[PDB]
Design a protein that fits this description.
Layout (H helix, E strand, L loop, with lengths): L6 E8 L5 H11 L5 E6 L2 E6 L8 H8 L4 E7 L7 H11 L4 E6 L8 H12 L3 E3 L1 E4 L7 E4 L4 E5 L7 E4 L6 H15 L4 H7 L7 H13 L4 E6 L7 H11 L10 E3 L5 E3 L9 E10 L3 E10 L1 E3 L2 E5 L5 E10 L4 E4 L1 E3 L3 E6 L8 E3 L18 E7 L5 H11 L7 E4 L6 E5 L2 H14 L4 E3 L3 E2 L2 E4 L3 E9 L6 E11 L6 E5 L11 H12 L12 E9 L7 H15 L5 E15 L3 H9 L7 E5 L2 E6 L9 H5 L8 E11 L2 H7 L1
Parallel strand pairs: 1-3, 1-4, 4-5, 5-11, 6-11, 31-32
Antiparallel strand pairs: 2-3, 7-8, 8-9, 9-10, 12-13, 14-15, 14-22, 15-21, 16-20, 17-18, 17-22, 18-19, 18-21, 23-25, 23-26, 23-27, 24-25, 28-33, 29-30, 30-32, 33-35, 33-36, 34-35
Helix pairs in contact: 5-7, 11-12
The structure holds guanosine-5'-diphosphate (GDP) and magnesium ion.
Length: 655
Amino acid sequence: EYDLKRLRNIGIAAHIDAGKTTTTERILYYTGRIAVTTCFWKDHRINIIDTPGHVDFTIEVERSMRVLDGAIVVFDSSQGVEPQSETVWRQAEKYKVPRIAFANKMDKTGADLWLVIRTMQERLGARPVVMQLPIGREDTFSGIIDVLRMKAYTYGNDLGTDIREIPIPEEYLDQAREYHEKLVEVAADFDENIMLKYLEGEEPTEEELVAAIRKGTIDLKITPVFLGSALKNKGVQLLLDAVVDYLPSPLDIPPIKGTTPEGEVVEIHPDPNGPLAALAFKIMADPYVGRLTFIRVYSGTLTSGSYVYNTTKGRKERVARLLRMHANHREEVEELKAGDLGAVVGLKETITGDTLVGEDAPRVILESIEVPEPVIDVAIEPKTKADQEKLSQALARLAEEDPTFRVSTHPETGQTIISGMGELHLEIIVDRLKREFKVDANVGKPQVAYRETITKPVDVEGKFIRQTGGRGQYGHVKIKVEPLPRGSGFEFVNAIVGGVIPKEYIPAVQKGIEEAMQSGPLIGFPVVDIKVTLYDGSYKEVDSSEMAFKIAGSMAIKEAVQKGDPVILEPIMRVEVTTPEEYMGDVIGDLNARRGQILGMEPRGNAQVIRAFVPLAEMFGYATDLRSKTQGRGSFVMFFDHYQEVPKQVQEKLI
Ligand SMILES: Nc1nc2c(ncn2[C@@H]2O[C@H](COP(=O)(O)OP(=O)(O)O)[C@@H](O)[C@H]2O)c(=O)[nH]1
Ligand SMILES: [Mg+2]
């Protein structure tokens, strides 16, 4: 039943509209006749892993690529590797994932196989090796020639229900012999035994070839290529074969790496008997069973009805059931062994990124712990409260699956404000808002979340003394406000000596300080990184109140941040641009005019990779500035890094 060798853990990467969904639907179908979906082909368990909706989704991508072992990259035979198709490739390259390739849509007009092969060779530097030729051109496209084995299959309809092996037609007999030769010439690069047979012109054996091509695929040197039309059902069974021949099992890729509690790195082996280590990569809210938290298992066995320690978060979780999702049904299983993926039921306080271990087995983490700061805000004016009522429920329901964002109510516009770690993040949340959770609102343009703070210690005071509301009000506080090292946040001390301020009012003061740190004086963004010591004041015996000392506190914070040489803090993003070698300096220059700070350029593949420190505020609509400077071919990722005082002229320009 469970045999690692015969496990094939895959995802499908493709341009948008290239054919990922159709190809996936079609695979499921063919493996039918008897977040992570499971099926069987020729005694192999193929766990198709769902790869992000768009490639820019950078956090999900990284995580969904160490959850898979090998990938199928799908190109539109009409257009070639369309500049975003280069970008999905760079992904696989980046995460060192063994891959095959699939020239989809060989049935449409414009479908050129050779365009794909060439563009793969030239642009991506991929080393395609042709493993089949198409019999036919457009609508004429009817057959597919396996040049490894020198056979040919023909398709008697566009339904998937008539595949007959035929000899290669003599019209394609030259071309096939030609490409078989190329294949055997390649295979010999990875098998010495095949080298001494290619000399002799002694046709080596299918075992040898397949093994050789495979070794090459898995060690990231070659990229076999197959074609077909997933829509008109041709080539999807051979593509499925390909998965089982050339794509890696968990035994084939190097073991994932994990961090002990002492910052140390451990290599983590697929030994199904050894300790347990799982990584959770998606949470979903299934109707018939509640919340499913999908995991991938690296070592040991995860047994249904058992307890696992969540090393990311400190608690234990109850593994109630274990599931496998199939195309058309679910399946309860007793265990998921090392090399496998499923869903688990139970697990109240487990979220994605988190690491599940064997309870009394070594505590290791598998990702980074730090939380991306909420660096981009968006305002939404809800409809007529009839939407707010289902908005608010949804937004708080959004945070049952996602803790990487914050919800606030703006101190002085009334609006509801979402905060995230980038724009796309928010763009997809709004997507889930007006559709999935059905909500409507006047959405605002995304903006950078700045922060204020003071650069020098001050010693101010606050007085509120009025005859409002019928009675007499009075509250007097004196504070010392001093700057706190970056990222330290807030600190309050009470140092009031002896009823100088009546104990009842100290809370009211604090509230006042708190409610007024929410709007700095430079641009009305939250004050941060300061220490507030309440050290004096006065009351008037009947006139004082809570309202009074609230405002007094508030009025002294507004003073302390005006006198303290206030400065604005901006978020500084860590940027990695992937560009073809040619645009290097023409791209570096553009980063350098964004107040960037180049940290060094090493090459990845044939492309090059620049590292920088560009501030978030010099980045809005960056992707269209890359596609203008890289002939469409470049791309970039972006992560928070640190807040930095704005430079003099940017302070002035932001006021
Ligand atoms: N002509 C043709 N069209 C295809 C083929 N495969 C997919 N499509 C088209 O692609 C569209 C859906 O694309 P999809 O599979 O979702 O690609 P994705 O955007 O990468 O997920 C459908 O409208 C299909 O008409 C094919 O083999 N031939
Ligand atoms: Mg799709």
